[PDB]
Amino acid sequence: EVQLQQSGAELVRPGALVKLSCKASGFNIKDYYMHWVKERPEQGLEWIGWIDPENGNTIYDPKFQGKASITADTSSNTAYLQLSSLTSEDTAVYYCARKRGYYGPYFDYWGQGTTLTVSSKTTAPSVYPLAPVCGDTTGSSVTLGCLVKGYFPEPVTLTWNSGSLSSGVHTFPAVLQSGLYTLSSSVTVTSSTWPSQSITCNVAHPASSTKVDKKIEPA
């Protein structure tokens, strides 16, 4: 069983340093070349460089030759990548890969990926939400919704009705704004529970323990 396990989930103020690790298990780091690859959010894979652990020779992609330093330690059986002078552009998932020759036909085994976040913010979420129903003629499905906005830096899990929800629960992927975040989630079902006994939204930001509920009242 060959594996490469990576350090995970770093969050780094910009302009700093960071070092990402890739520990091999089941083979010798020394018999291989170790490659680092970067996958930006919704972008293609990019190659950073390789290191020959025997003699420590490193080759880089000319666009990483300034601020990437690949090192390795055979005694610990582990390879490292140091990113320096970080910026907003650096946020991506870094992969450690294993190739046999200078021209090995493939990367047979890959690292689990290490998300790196370069930002300068940290706060709690603001859950504001309401259903709208006015001037309507015949109700569609009362289509209630929620809006968590301005989250400092965490992955919210806004789920409605506390598992009493239905398949009618669409969670819109979050997006950044003014270095904060924003999300949304909608539900539309059971046009009878609109106006009458209804359900509520419950959103919990772990990095701030903002486990707040909000029952959406009518217009």
Binding site: S126, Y128, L130, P132, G145, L147
Partner: peptide, 20 residues
């Protein structure tokens, strides 16, 4: 489905209108 700004947001110096 359009949803007009919420009261608590309306006092929060900004008003965001969502369409779903």
């Amino acid at each position: 489905s359009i949803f007009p700004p919420s009261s608590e947001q309306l006092t929060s110096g900004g008003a965001s209108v969502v369409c779903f």
